[PDB]
Design a protein around this nucleic acid. Structure first.
Lengths: 77, 219, 63, 148, 11, 125, 67, 143, 213
RNA sequence: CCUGCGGCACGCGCGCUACACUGACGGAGCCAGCGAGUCUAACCUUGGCCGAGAGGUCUUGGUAAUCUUGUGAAACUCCGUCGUGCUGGGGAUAGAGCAUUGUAAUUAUUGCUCUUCAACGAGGAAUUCCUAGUAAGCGC
């Protein structure tokens, strides 16, 4: 367990769901945070204080580069 | 001579009238129906909601009332008013412009509620005598010679202007003061049926769109 | 603290009582002899049983 | 009514002789009002009085006993049948349908009645029991035993 | 001023 | 021919046209069995004419009911009305009379709204 | 990183060393100070495995877990 | 002793048949199917992007079955809900046309429906068979 | 000794009526679970105002109870408890939500205290309804609290009011919904544990009325 | 915020919104009534097809208890996700793009799509409407 963490210059609070912890990043939708956990094969109902840095950057590679991971173009911010 | 609809009742039976409101009334006009309920005697206020105009008419001819007073409003300011005599009698949709509700002013008290004298001014036209005989029968017959409140219906400039007054008589002059609503009022259509009917014969109808519309009076 | 029930005989009319409060001659249930003129608060009719926390006071007018 | 044909000998012989009859005259001319119990038959026929004819319904005992006593309600809606094995079947009189089957006696029932108010019902057996029924409810009110 | 019937009772 | 009896059932603005004919014991509402009525809590509000009198008396009859108008609730008060009326008007026609007065006294003691339309016509005070 | 268990690896200790103590619901399981390094309601979950001898209650659910 | 889909409750039917067409595997779910919102006044795409298109075909089949023929403009209005306009009043809006048109072209390949005369789409004798089949399977779920 | 045979064939239907419903034709049960028999109002003077004699299936008798003065008494109190649950502008005119709460609430009272839910609800109303309530006097501008007695219809009306308000207020910002906290009320109001809303608030209304009488 | 009345930064009146768990969100269940609708023209519009949507498009029925339309309206119901955190409650302010009406949309006509995520934790003194299918909720 590691609490408050930094993803794409944004401090992500650890004791909440990653489907909702990613939504504190500016502009990214709730459904957009719902898709990336599905695309990165991450359990939706985990807390953000989980998720080892192996599975973190796979979310990062999808989130900062959407169009190379079959993300629909309307679904960006 | 009284009108043919009012002829059988004319002086014999007191009227009983109903003041009711349009549909989901604003709290300003739901006050204002009570000033109409107070301006006449024998007036009860039945709040209307999810009644239809058939089953509020048809459940009123049954119970037996002389006529029906329904109001409308714009954003709290009441605008319209109809009186409709029930035993297949006429109706008169009035537009009323300058209103001052009684609840705005001060807690000066409460009205006299006794039988009023009336004042009808400047009714010359035969259609003007229709509006006389259709308004006059909303009051209980035969007021006392010394009752103290008098209700004026004044017709300067085709807008029937009605005010409510009390009076006392001093050693020389009469001195009056105003209670109750100020109206301007204007009838604009006059059916021979009730306000239910909507295809009855139109005795009079305010034509707006006519080359000589602004010229005549009672037209 | 024993509680004595009472059955209502006759509501009282024309007595000048404060609004909301009505005045009632009750009859004791456990001994059908006595009566006590108590006041009610809610809506009451005859032939209903009323609950008295105290028997011996006998309520007068409330102006 | 049913459509299947009636079972009987084609050389028509008369009904076996009648040992118990009951008749209540209250609803005559609209359905049957005469119930007769024939000698040594497990059923017991009905008769219309006004048309002078055997009625269309026949009443069975449902426990293979001989009918020794019959009665009708004063309203003329219920037909009692007292079997020779205790069973008191109560058939209705419009349709001939079965409604209630009473079981108190063990020997032959030899008389039923219903009171005037259609409330209480009696029965008497060869075992000596005189049972007193309620009929609105189906409860046994009481039970009396004589000697013989 | 007492209401009548009460003024019977204290008289 | 076929013995039938047609009765109506009416709540707020919902009709209920219940044909009752001698048959095998199926009970349909809008071409669907009566175990599939919509509001799912008020399903026992329409089992009342089934279960008050006893489910035996439906063994020989059909109850075809079709409803229009109304809402979710005010149709359920129409199918419980037209099944009660459609049952108690078949025993006075094609079955025995003493059945009918047993039924009409059964639905009465439970709820009289099954039979006659409780019309909430207005009152002016 | 660092072990993916503790404080909650102690919260485990005092967890199964007090849960059998009380017990009650999830609003009550809210006590002991529920934080990250694990999860909230999930507590009762792995607590459905063994038992205790006491009560419980559900929310969006609906149960009286004899944990 | 015989079953029609009308003998099976609405949902438990479209539930077991939408999971029959997934195990069946031949449907042709089109190319997008994760990104579309399905309707007029919708907010989010379906909460189950796995089994929704098969949930919806399994609905569409039970609906054209019970009817003579129903077109695409008709599936929209059935599947359109109320749209929240925000600070404005709610009103009815038809669903997405491409979706329900691509359930119809795609149920003609498995033969569960066919072009009708008079217009629309109609259930095919083969799809009338399959639907009656699983209407029994669901009926018999009672062990 | 004696037997009545009233049913002659095994009654089976072409439409399958389930096993729990065909069993329900012997006694009428509330929500097909709860018997109105063996349910006694354990306080006299409250019989003829708490009406549990006529059994009912669901708590939805849509009959007219507002017209006469005391027609309100014969409402079967389980419905009269559901009617006081829809008292808020977020809640007016939603009865099927309220009936679904009570059927979920009456289950909870069983699971906790096995007895009956409906014996508890009757025993709740007997406890919380006050016995002497205090009224305001005129007194010529200086108002003192004058203590009087209370009619047994008001004893029921205010009892039902305090329970549902006590449940609606205690479940204001909690994970516990209306359904569970009301069962926390009625169980505590049955014992009169002074840890419920209404047993507390009665114990001012009978406290204040003792102070000035 | 919308609107009316005053005032000329503000005073007043009618109102709409939400503050959330009796909720929101996602599926799913699916039920009204009053109504309107095209000629010398472009009306109400099913159905098919295309578009995440808004909309587009090829066709059709209807001068109408005939076709739209069973206006499959909304609250509401169930199953699920959220878990009391200005939280997933609330959607103001605003950035960027795509549509529609129109000779003309800048001072945004409106609609749609993504992002931005404010006040507001039940509202002082005041004060409105209301007695049964009504009050209030809710859509047409």
């Amino acid at each position: 367990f590691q609490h408050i963490l930094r993803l794409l210059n944004t401090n992500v609070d650890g004791n909440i769901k990653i489907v909702y912890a990613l939504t504190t990043i500016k502009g990214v939708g709730r459904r957009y945070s719902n898709l990336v956990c599905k695309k990165a094969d991450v359990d939706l109902h985990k807390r953000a204080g989980e998720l080892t840095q192996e599975e973190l950057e796979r979310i990062v590679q999808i989130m900062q580069n959407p169009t190379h991971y079959k993300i629909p173009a309307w679904f960006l911010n | 001579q009284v009108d043919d609809e009012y002829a059988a009742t004319s002086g014999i039976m007191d009227p009983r009238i109903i003041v009711t409101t349009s549909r989901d009334p604003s709290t300003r006009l739901s006050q204002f129906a009570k000033e109409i309920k107070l301006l006449f005697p024998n007036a009860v206020r039945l709040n209307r909601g999810n009644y239809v105009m058939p089953n509020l008419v048809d459940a009123c001819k049954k119970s037996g009332t002389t006529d029906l007073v329904v109001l409308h409003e714009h954003r709290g300011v009441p605008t319209s008013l109809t009186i409709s005599h029930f035993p297949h009698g006429p109706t008169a949709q009035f537009s009323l412009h300058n209103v001052v509700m009684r609840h705005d002013i001060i807690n000066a008290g409460n009205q006299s509620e006794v039988n009023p004298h009336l004042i009808f001014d400047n009714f010359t036209t035969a259609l003007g005598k229709r509006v006389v005989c259709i308004l006059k029968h909303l009051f209980n017959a035969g007021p006392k010679k010394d009752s103290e409140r008098v209700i004026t219906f004044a017709n300067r400039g085709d807008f029937i202007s009605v005010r409510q007054h009390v009076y006392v008589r001093t050693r020389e002059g009469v001195e009056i003061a105003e209670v109750g609503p100020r109206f301007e009022m204007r009838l604009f259509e006059l059916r021979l049926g009730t306000l239910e009917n909507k295809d009855a014969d139109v005795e009079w109808q305010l034509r707006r769109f006519i080359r000589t519309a602004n010229k005549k009076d009672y037209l | 603290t024993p509680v004595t029930l009472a059955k209502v005989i006759k509501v009282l009319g024309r007595t000048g009582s404060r609004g909301g409060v009505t005045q009632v001659r009750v009859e004791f249930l456990e001994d059908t002899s006595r009566t006590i003129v108590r006041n009610v608060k809610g809506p009451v009719r005859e032939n209903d049983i009323l609950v008295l926390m105290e028997s011996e006071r006998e309520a007068r007018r409330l102006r | 009514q049913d459509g299947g044909r009636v079972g009987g000998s084609t050389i028509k012989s008369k009904f076996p002789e009648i040992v118990a009859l009951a008749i209540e005259n209250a609803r005559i001319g609209e359905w049957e009002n005469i119930i007769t119990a024939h000698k040594d038959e497990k059923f017991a026929r009905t008769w219309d009085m006004r048309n002078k004819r055997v009625g269309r319904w026949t009443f069975d005992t449902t426990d293979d006993g001989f009918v020794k006593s019959v009665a009708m309600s004063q309203c003329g809606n219920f037909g009692f049948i007292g079997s020779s094995n205790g069973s008191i079947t109560i058939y209705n009189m419009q349709s001939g349908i079965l409604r209630k089957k009473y079981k108190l006696h063990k020997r032959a029932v030899t008389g039923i009645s219903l009171d005037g108010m259609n409330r209480k019902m009696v029965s008497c057996g060869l075992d000596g029991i005189v049972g007193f029924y309620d009929f609105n409810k189906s409860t046994l009110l009481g039970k009396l035993k004589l000697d013989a | 001023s007492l209401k009548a019937g009460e003024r019977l009772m204290e008289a | 021919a076929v013995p039938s009896v047609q009765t109506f059932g009416k709540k707020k603005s919902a009709t209920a046209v219940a044909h009752v004919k001698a048959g095998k014991g199926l009970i349909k509402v809008n071409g669907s069995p009566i175990t599939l009525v919509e509001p799912e809590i008020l399903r026992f509000k329409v089992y009342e004419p089934l279960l008050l009198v006893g489910l035996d008396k439906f063994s020989n009859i059909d109850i075809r009911v079709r409803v229009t108008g109304g809402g979710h609730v005010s149709q359920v008060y129409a199918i419980r009305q037209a099944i009660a009326k459609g049952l108690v008007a078949y025993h006075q026609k094609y079955v025995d009379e003493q059945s009918k007065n047993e039924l009409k006294k059964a639905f009465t003691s439970y709820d009289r709204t099954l039979l006659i339309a409780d019309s909430r016509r207005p009152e002016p005070k | 990183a660092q072990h993916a268990v503790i404080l909650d690896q102690e919260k485990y200790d005092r967890i199964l060393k007090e849960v059998p103590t009380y017990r009650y619901v999830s609003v009550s399981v809210l006590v002991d100070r529920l934080k990250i390094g694990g999860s909230l309601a999930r507590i009762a979950l792995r607590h459905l495995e063994k038992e205790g001898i006491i009560k419980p209650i559900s929310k969006h659910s609906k149960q009286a877990i004899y944990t | 002793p015989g079953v029609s889909v009308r003998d099976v409750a609405a949902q438990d039917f479209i539930n077991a048949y939408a999971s029959f067409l997934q195990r069946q595997g031949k449907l042709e779910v089109p190319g997008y199917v994760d990104i579309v919102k399905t309707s007029s006044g919708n907010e989010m795409p379906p909460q189950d992007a796995e089994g929704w298109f098969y949930k919806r075909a399994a609905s569409v089949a039970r609906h054209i079955y019970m009817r003579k023929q129903v077109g695409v403009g008709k599936l929209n209005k059935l599947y359109g809900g109320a749209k929240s306009r925000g600070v404005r009043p709610y009103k009815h809006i038809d669903a997405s046309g491409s979706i329900n048109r691509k359930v119809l072209q795609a149920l003609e390949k498995i033969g569960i429906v066919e072009i009708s005369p008079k217009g629309g789409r109609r259930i095919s004798e083969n799809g009338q068979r399959d639907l009656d089949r699983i209407a029994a399977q669901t009926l018999e779920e009672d062990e | 000794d004696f037997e009545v045979v009233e049913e002659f064939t095994p009654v089976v239907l072409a439409t399958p009526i389930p096993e729990e419903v065909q069993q329900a034709q012997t006694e009428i049960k509330l929500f097909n679970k709860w018997s109105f028999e063996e349910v006694e109002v354990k306080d006299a003077s409250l019989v003829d105002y708490v009406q549990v004699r006529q059994p009912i299936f669901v708590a939805h008798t849509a009959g007219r109870y507002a017209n006469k003065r005391f027609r309100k008494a014969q409402c079967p109190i389980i419905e009269r408890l559901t009617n006081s649950l829809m008292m808020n502008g977020r809640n007016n005119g939603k009865k099927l939500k309220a009936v679904r709460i009570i059927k979920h609430t009456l289950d909870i009272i069983n699971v906790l205290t096995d007895q009956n839910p409906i014996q508890v609800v009757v025993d709740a109303i007997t406890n919380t309804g006050p016995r002497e309530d205090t009224t305001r006097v005129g007194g010529g501008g200086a108002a003192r609290r004058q203590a009087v007695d209370v009619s047994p219809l008001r004893r029921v009306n205010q009892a039902i009011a305090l329970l549902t308000i006590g449940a609606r207020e205690a479940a204001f910002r909690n994970i516990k919904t209306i359904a569970e906290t009301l069962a926390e009320e009625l169980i505590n109001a049955a014992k009169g544990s002074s840890t419920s809303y209404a047993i507390k608030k009665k114990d001012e209304l009978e406290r204040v009325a003792k102070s000035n009488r």
